[PDB]
Short mmCIF file of C-alpha atoms in Angstrom, two decimals:
data_model
loop_
_atom_site.label_atom_id
_atom_site.label_comp_id
_atom_site.label_asym_id
_atom_site.label_seq_id
_atom_site.Cartn_x
_atom_site.Cartn_y
_atom_site.Cartn_z
CA UNK A 2146 -29.66 64.59 -26.54
CA UNK A 2147 -28.94 67.16 -23.84
CA UNK A 2148 -28.64 64.40 -21.23
CA UNK A 2149 -26.04 62.62 -23.36
CA UNK A 2150 -24.23 65.89 -24.10
CA UNK A 2151 -24.00 66.86 -20.43
CA UNK A 2152 -22.96 63.38 -19.31
CA UNK A 2153 -20.29 63.33 -22.03
CA UNK A 2154 -18.98 66.73 -20.95
CA UNK A 2155 -18.94 65.63 -17.32
CA UNK A 2156 -16.97 62.48 -18.11
CA UNK A 2157 -14.58 64.40 -20.37
CA UNK A 2158 -14.07 66.98 -17.61
CA UNK A 2159 -12.80 64.64 -14.86
CA UNK A 2160 -9.51 64.00 -16.67
CA UNK A 2161 -6.67 66.21 -15.37
CA UNK A 2162 -5.81 69.27 -17.44
CA UNK A 2163 -2.77 70.75 -15.66
CA UNK A 2164 0.58 68.97 -15.77
CA UNK A 2165 4.21 69.62 -14.91
CA UNK A 2166 5.36 70.27 -11.37
CA UNK A 2167 1.67 70.98 -10.65
CA UNK A 2168 -0.92 68.25 -11.18
CA UNK A 2169 -4.65 67.61 -11.02
CA UNK A 2170 -6.97 70.48 -11.84
CA UNK A 2171 -9.99 68.35 -12.75
CA UNK A 2172 -13.50 69.25 -11.55
CA UNK A 2173 -14.58 66.56 -9.07
CA UNK A 2174 -18.10 68.10 -9.01
CA UNK A 2175 -18.67 67.72 -12.76
CA UNK A 2176 -20.91 64.65 -12.39
CA UNK A 2177 -23.18 66.33 -9.84
CA UNK A 2178 -23.26 69.47 -12.00
CA UNK A 2179 -24.30 67.43 -15.05
CA UNK A 2180 -26.97 65.62 -13.01
CA UNK A 2181 -28.17 69.04 -11.87
CA UNK A 2182 -28.31 70.48 -15.38
CA UNK A 2183 -30.18 67.44 -16.76
CA UNK A 2184 -32.64 67.61 -13.86
CA UNK A 2185 -33.01 71.35 -14.47
CA UNK A 2186 -33.86 70.77 -18.13
CA UNK A 2187 -36.30 67.97 -17.22
CA UNK A 2188 -38.75 70.44 -15.63
CA UNK A 2189 -38.51 72.68 -18.70
CA UNK A 2190 -39.21 69.83 -21.12
CA UNK A 2191 -42.13 68.59 -19.00
CA UNK A 2192 -43.53 72.14 -19.11
CA UNK A 2193 -43.14 72.46 -22.89
CA UNK A 2194 -44.58 69.00 -23.52
CA UNK B 1171 -18.24 57.65 -9.53
CA UNK B 1172 -16.60 54.59 -7.96
CA UNK B 1173 -13.07 53.26 -8.21
CA UNK B 1174 -13.08 50.06 -10.30
CA UNK B 1175 -16.85 49.71 -9.87
CA UNK B 1176 -16.50 49.25 -6.12
CA UNK B 1177 -20.17 49.86 -5.41
CA UNK B 1178 -22.18 47.62 -3.11
CA UNK B 1179 -25.79 48.22 -2.01
CA UNK B 1180 -26.91 47.50 1.53
CA UNK B 1181 -30.19 47.68 3.43
CA UNK B 1182 -29.85 49.53 6.73
CA UNK B 1183 -32.75 50.10 9.14
CA UNK B 1184 -35.03 48.75 6.37
CA UNK B 1185 -33.84 51.48 3.97
CA UNK B 1186 -31.69 51.05 0.86
CA UNK B 1187 -28.17 52.50 1.14
CA UNK B 1188 -25.26 52.67 -1.29
CA UNK B 1189 -21.57 52.42 -0.44
CA UNK B 1190 -19.00 53.13 -3.13
CA UNK B 1191 -15.27 53.85 -2.98
CA UNK B 1192 -14.12 56.88 -4.94
CA UNK B 1193 -10.44 57.50 -5.65
CA UNK B 1194 -9.20 60.98 -6.53
CA UNK B 1195 -5.83 60.67 -8.29
CA UNK B 1196 -3.38 63.53 -8.87
CA UNK B 1197 0.00 63.20 -10.61
CA UNK B 1198 2.88 65.48 -11.56
CA UNK B 1199 6.49 65.28 -12.71
CA UNK B 1200 9.41 66.06 -10.42
CA UNK B 1207 12.61 63.02 -14.31
CA UNK B 1208 10.13 61.14 -12.10
CA UNK B 1209 6.33 61.06 -11.91
CA UNK B 1210 4.78 61.51 -8.46
CA UNK B 1211 1.21 60.53 -7.61
CA UNK B 1212 -1.23 61.45 -4.83
CA UNK B 1213 -4.28 59.34 -3.95
CA UNK B 1214 -7.15 60.19 -1.62
CA UNK B 1215 -9.55 57.24 -1.24
CA UNK B 1216 -13.02 58.41 -0.13
CA UNK B 1217 -15.81 56.01 0.87
CA UNK B 1218 -19.23 57.56 0.18
CA UNK B 1219 -22.56 56.50 1.72
CA UNK C 1269 -10.01 80.52 24.28
CA UNK C 1270 -8.03 77.31 24.48
CA UNK C 1271 -9.98 74.18 25.31
CA UNK C 1272 -9.51 72.96 28.88
CA UNK C 1273 -11.05 70.10 30.83
CA UNK C 1274 -12.03 72.22 33.86
CA UNK C 1275 -13.47 75.65 34.59
CA UNK C 1276 -10.68 75.98 37.18
CA UNK C 1277 -8.21 76.21 34.27
CA UNK C 1278 -10.02 79.05 32.47
CA UNK C 1279 -9.42 81.19 35.59
CA UNK C 1280 -5.95 82.02 34.19
CA UNK C 1281 -6.34 81.21 30.48
CA UNK C 1282 -4.65 83.67 28.13
CA UNK C 1283 -7.95 84.94 26.72
CA UNK C 1284 -7.83 86.18 23.14
CA UNK C 1285 -10.69 88.19 21.79
CA UNK C 1286 -11.98 91.15 19.81
CA UNK C 1287 -14.88 93.61 19.72
CA UNK C 1288 -17.50 93.98 16.99
CA UNK C 1289 -19.44 97.25 16.75
CA UNK C 1290 -22.82 98.08 15.26
CA UNK C 1291 -21.24 99.30 12.00
CA UNK C 1292 -19.30 95.98 11.97
CA UNK C 1293 -15.98 97.67 12.49
CA UNK C 1294 -13.83 95.84 15.02
CA UNK C 1295 -11.06 96.35 17.55
CA UNK C 1296 -8.82 93.84 19.29
CA UNK C 1297 -9.25 93.46 23.05
CA UNK C 1298 -6.45 94.37 25.43
CA UNK C 1299 -5.31 91.42 27.60
CA UNK C 1300 -6.43 93.21 30.78
CA UNK C 1301 -9.70 94.02 29.00
CA UNK C 1302 -10.13 90.43 27.80
CA UNK C 1303 -9.33 89.13 31.31
CA UNK C 1304 -12.15 91.23 32.78
CA UNK C 1305 -14.66 89.54 30.45
CA UNK C 1306 -12.94 86.24 31.25
CA UNK C 1307 -13.24 86.55 35.02
CA UNK C 1308 -16.86 87.70 34.93
CA UNK C 1309 -18.03 84.88 32.61
CA UNK C 1310 -15.47 82.08 32.74
CA UNK C 1311 -18.18 79.56 33.67
CA UNK C 1312 -19.96 79.90 30.32
CA UNK C 1313 -16.87 78.70 28.43
CA UNK C 1314 -17.22 75.19 27.03
CA UNK C 1315 -15.15 72.29 28.37
CA UNK C 1316 -13.69 69.42 26.37
CA UNK C 1317 -16.48 67.08 27.52
CA UNK C 1318 -19.38 69.48 28.30
CA UNK C 1319 -20.91 72.08 25.95
CA UNK C 1320 -22.44 75.14 27.62
CA UNK C 1321 -24.92 77.83 26.56
CA UNK C 1322 -23.83 81.46 26.40
CA UNK C 1323 -25.65 84.39 28.01
CA UNK C 1324 -25.73 88.17 27.77
CA UNK C 1325 -22.75 89.71 29.52
CA UNK C 1326 -23.03 90.59 33.21
CA UNK C 1327 -20.88 92.71 35.51
CA UNK C 1600 -26.40 78.95 39.07
CA UNK C 1601 -24.54 76.75 36.63
CA UNK C 1602 -25.05 77.79 33.02
CA UNK C 1603 -27.46 76.10 30.64
CA UNK C 1604 -25.91 73.06 29.00
CA UNK C 1605 -26.35 70.75 26.00
CA UNK C 1606 -25.63 67.04 26.42
CA UNK C 1607 -25.40 64.57 23.54
CA UNK C 1608 -26.30 61.31 25.25
CA UNK C 1609 -24.82 58.03 24.05
CA UNK C 1610 -28.29 56.62 23.30
CA UNK C 1611 -28.80 59.47 20.80
CA UNK C 1612 -31.06 61.73 22.87
CA UNK C 1613 -30.00 65.36 22.93
CA UNK C 1614 -31.27 67.35 25.90
CA UNK C 1615 -30.78 70.75 27.51
CA UNK C 1616 -30.06 70.78 31.24
CA UNK C 1617 -30.46 73.55 33.79
CA UNK C 1618 -30.13 72.58 37.48
CA UNK C 1619 -32.55 69.66 38.07
CA UNK C 1620 -34.42 70.28 34.81
CA UNK C 1621 -33.72 68.48 31.54
CA UNK C 1622 -35.64 69.05 28.31
CA UNK C 1623 -35.36 67.08 25.08
CA UNK C 1624 -34.20 68.79 21.88
CA UNK C 1625 -34.15 66.21 19.07
CA UNK C 1626 -36.46 63.26 18.46
CA UNK C 1627 -35.51 59.81 17.15
CA UNK C 1628 -39.05 59.22 15.88
CA UNK C 1629 -38.19 59.80 12.21
CA UNK C 1630 -35.24 57.38 12.42
CA UNK C 1631 -37.44 54.58 13.81
CA UNK C 1632 -40.30 55.42 11.40
CA UNK C 1633 -38.55 53.93 8.34
CA UNK C 1634 -39.64 50.42 9.37
CA UNK C 1635 -43.22 51.69 9.65
CA UNK C 1636 -42.93 53.35 6.24
CA UNK C 1637 -41.82 50.14 4.55
CA UNK C 1638 -45.46 48.94 4.80
CA UNK C 1639 -47.00 52.26 3.71
CA UNK C 1640 -49.42 55.00 4.73
CA UNK C 1641 -51.84 52.78 6.66
CA UNK C 1642 -48.94 51.91 8.98
CA UNK C 1643 -47.52 55.46 9.25
CA UNK C 1644 -50.79 56.75 10.72
CA UNK C 1645 -51.44 53.69 12.91
CA UNK C 1646 -51.67 53.81 16.70
CA UNK C 1647 -48.55 51.78 17.52
CA UNK C 1648 -46.55 54.15 15.31
CA UNK C 1649 -47.48 56.94 17.74
CA UNK C 1650 -46.05 54.68 20.48
CA UNK C 1651 -42.52 54.49 19.12
CA UNK C 1652 -40.35 54.99 22.19
CA UNK C 1653 -38.12 57.93 22.85
CA UNK C 1654 -34.80 56.90 24.44
CA UNK C 1655 -34.36 58.38 27.89
CA UNK C 1656 -32.29 61.53 28.32
CA UNK C 1657 -29.50 61.83 30.88
CA UNK C 1658 -29.15 59.43 33.79
CA UNK C 1659 -32.22 58.61 35.84
CA UNK C 1660 -34.99 56.17 36.64
CA UNK C 1661 -38.66 56.00 35.65
CA UNK C 1662 -40.96 56.03 38.68
CA UNK C 1663 -44.74 55.57 38.78
CA UNK C 1664 -46.66 57.54 41.42
CA UNK C 1665 -50.29 56.85 42.33
CA UNK C 1666 -52.20 59.86 43.65
CA UNK C 1667 -54.61 58.96 46.49
CA UNK C 1668 -58.31 59.85 46.18
CA UNK C 1669 -59.25 63.40 47.11
CA UNK C 1670 -60.87 63.74 50.51
CA UNK C 1671 -61.59 66.97 52.38
CA UNK C 1672 -60.29 65.68 55.73
CA UNK C 1673 -57.01 64.44 54.24
CA UNK C 1674 -56.41 67.15 51.62
CA UNK C 1675 -58.48 70.26 52.38
CA UNK C 1676 -60.91 72.21 50.25
CA UNK C 1677 -58.41 73.30 47.60
CA UNK C 1678 -57.82 70.25 45.39
CA UNK C 1679 -54.40 71.34 44.07
CA UNK C 1680 -51.34 69.17 44.64
CA UNK C 1681 -47.69 69.53 43.61
CA UNK C 1682 -44.91 66.97 43.25
CA UNK C 1683 -41.52 68.30 44.39
CA UNK C 1684 -38.08 66.80 43.80
CA UNK C 1685 -35.23 67.42 46.23
CA UNK C 1686 -31.56 66.52 46.82
CA UNK C 1687 -30.89 66.39 43.07
CA UNK C 1688 -28.21 68.91 42.03
CA UNK C 1689 -29.02 71.15 45.00
CA UNK C 1690 -30.69 70.84 48.38
CA UNK C 1691 -33.42 73.33 47.46
CA UNK C 1692 -36.48 71.54 46.11
CA UNK C 1693 -37.91 71.92 42.61
CA UNK C 1694 -41.42 71.32 41.31
CA UNK C 1695 -41.72 68.37 38.93
CA UNK C 1696 -45.51 67.99 38.59
CA UNK C 1697 -48.64 69.96 39.46
CA UNK C 1698 -52.24 68.82 39.30
CA UNK C 1699 -55.71 68.63 40.80
CA UNK C 1700 -56.73 65.81 43.14
CA UNK C 1701 -59.37 63.56 41.54
CA UNK C 1702 -61.81 61.29 43.31
CA UNK C 1703 -60.17 58.53 41.29
CA UNK C 1704 -56.50 57.78 41.65
CA UNK C 1705 -54.06 59.45 39.27
CA UNK C 1706 -51.18 57.43 37.85
CA UNK C 1707 -48.18 59.67 37.15
CA UNK C 1708 -45.01 58.26 35.57
CA UNK C 1709 -41.99 60.56 35.86
CA UNK C 1710 -38.39 60.45 34.75
CA UNK C 1711 -36.41 61.37 37.87
CA UNK C 1712 -32.95 62.82 37.08
CA UNK C 1713 -29.99 61.50 39.04
CA UNK C 1714 -26.72 63.37 39.52
CA UNK C 1715 -23.40 62.06 38.26
CA UNK C 1716 -22.40 61.75 41.93
CA UNK C 1717 -25.02 61.92 44.71
CA UNK C 1718 -25.28 64.64 47.33
CA UNK C 1719 -26.24 62.22 50.13
CA UNK C 1720 -25.06 58.64 50.58
CA UNK C 1721 -28.26 57.27 52.15
CA UNK C 1722 -30.67 58.70 49.56
CA UNK C 1723 -29.81 59.91 46.06
CA UNK C 1724 -33.12 61.69 45.38
CA UNK C 1725 -36.12 62.80 47.41
CA UNK C 1726 -39.69 63.28 46.20
CA UNK C 1727 -42.51 64.69 48.31
CA UNK C 1728 -46.04 65.73 47.37
CA UNK C 1729 -47.76 68.79 48.83
CA UNK C 1730 -51.40 69.84 49.02
CA UNK C 1731 -53.57 72.47 50.68
CA UNK C 1732 -53.99 70.61 53.99
CA UNK C 1733 -50.27 69.74 54.35
CA UNK C 1734 -48.10 72.04 52.20
CA UNK C 1735 -45.10 71.76 54.54
CA UNK C 1736 -42.53 69.04 53.89
CA UNK C 1737 -41.41 66.42 56.37
CA UNK C 1738 -37.84 65.17 56.57
CA UNK C 1739 -38.68 61.52 55.84
CA UNK C 1740 -42.32 62.03 54.86
CA UNK C 1741 -42.09 61.07 51.18
CA UNK C 1742 -40.38 58.48 48.95
CA UNK C 1743 -36.59 58.57 49.05
CA UNK C 1744 -34.74 56.87 46.19
CA UNK C 1745 -31.26 55.35 46.25
CA UNK C 1746 -29.16 53.58 43.61
CA UNK C 1747 -26.47 50.92 43.99
CA UNK C 1748 -23.41 50.37 41.79
CA UNK C 1749 -25.41 48.70 39.03
CA UNK C 1750 -28.37 50.53 37.51
CA UNK C 1751 -31.15 49.58 39.94
CA UNK C 1752 -33.11 51.98 42.14
CA UNK C 1753 -34.98 51.19 45.35
CA UNK C 1754 -37.08 53.10 47.88
CA UNK C 1755 -35.50 53.79 51.26
CA UNK C 1756 -37.54 52.01 53.98
CA UNK C 1757 -36.81 54.88 56.39
CA UNK C 1758 -39.05 57.13 54.26
CA UNK C 1759 -42.82 57.32 54.82
CA UNK C 1760 -45.08 56.77 51.81
CA UNK C 1761 -48.38 57.90 53.37
CA UNK C 1762 -48.97 60.72 50.86
CA UNK C 1763 -48.92 58.21 47.96
CA UNK C 1764 -51.33 55.36 47.29
CA UNK C 1765 -48.41 53.56 45.64
CA UNK C 1766 -44.90 54.36 44.44
CA UNK C 1767 -43.21 52.02 41.96
CA UNK C 1768 -39.80 52.18 40.27
CA UNK C 1769 -39.80 50.95 36.67
CA UNK C 1770 -36.21 49.70 36.73
CA UNK C 1771 -36.76 47.72 33.50
CA UNK C 1772 -37.68 50.87 31.52
CA UNK C 1773 -35.11 53.11 29.79
CA UNK C 1774 -37.44 54.88 27.32
CA UNK C 1775 -40.70 56.79 27.23
CA UNK C 1776 -43.52 57.35 24.70
CA UNK C 1777 -43.25 59.90 21.92
CA UNK C 1778 -44.20 63.33 23.28
CA UNK C 1779 -47.11 65.34 21.83
CA UNK C 1780 -46.24 68.27 24.12
CA UNK C 1781 -42.45 68.49 23.80
CA UNK C 1782 -40.33 70.45 21.34
CA UNK C 1783 -41.43 68.53 18.23
CA UNK C 1784 -45.05 68.56 19.45
CA UNK C 1785 -45.92 70.90 16.58
CA UNK C 1786 -44.51 68.54 13.95
CA UNK C 1787 -46.19 65.55 15.57
CA UNK C 1788 -49.58 67.26 15.57
CA UNK C 1789 -48.56 68.39 12.08
CA UNK C 1790 -48.44 64.82 10.85
CA UNK C 1791 -50.81 62.58 12.80
CA UNK C 1792 -53.92 64.83 12.82
CA UNK C 1793 -53.60 67.92 10.61
CA UNK C 1794 -52.32 66.13 7.51
CA UNK C 1795 -55.10 63.46 7.43
CA UNK C 1796 -57.72 66.14 8.14
CA UNK C 1797 -56.37 68.43 5.41
CA UNK C 1798 -56.30 65.53 2.94
CA UNK C 1799 -59.83 64.41 3.85
CA UNK C 1800 -61.05 68.01 3.52
CA UNK C 1801 -59.45 68.35 0.09
CA UNK C 1802 -60.88 65.02 -1.07
CA UNK C 1803 -64.32 66.19 0.11
CA UNK C 1804 -64.45 69.10 -2.35
#
């Protein structure tokens, strides 16, 4: 569930969120951040289990 | 995170490698819409 | 400083700089004051093609780092070159594709290191020790000469055996030779005859293509044989060089640690 949530947030984050005379603003690192969070949680779940 | 699923594996020096082409797109209005691309090949 | 192709250009370069103090305050340097530090140590400044090593300030070339085209990095000072990186781990991947039994194998420890700089591999055969020919002290030293500077340098030191000794050495060669008839000189000294003779050892010379040959004018008597390995442009992996610790770390310590753990 957390893996899906983080992947969904990463994908929803790459779309641009500033517009007008200024463009872009999306977080290019979001996919690596989500992969880092899900790997971070993996050690915690393996400890609990 | 490839552009248009431009990913292609390769074996180099007997090790598995991945090439994919990312595109970062940026757009804004100026009415006319401008666009910037920066194509970035990752290995 | 601005990048320039020659040290001769730094002699008048408009040197910018600043000072940093122990409390990490700073002050800009005056142009006169920067030009003092320039003129004392302009040789240590890097060139566009050659990277140099800095030194503590003073008031005979500098140490230098070359990135060879074959991938060997080495440090040079006068005639001496020493390797810095090792291409062992980049060649190991093929050995790893067939697993642990191949990583630890003998031929794996014989992956070649590409040669560093420009030079030729020469094999020297040390004659048997004899008291009449060599004297009571068994020491001998191999000296190189006429590379970089006329003054000779030691390249190997050993004890004379009753057997022959086979010694294979990388001999550096300069970008442009000092003498047209012989590009490098090697002579071996011992207790009986420590003094050098003008022609009394192997002289090496190189033509336009990469082949080296021994000058017939030179006298080989101090060597049982000298051979030039013109076909060889690499040498075995080095268990005494820089990465010697990591190589002993892997081939011997790791198996012994694992075997010891499995014992308990």
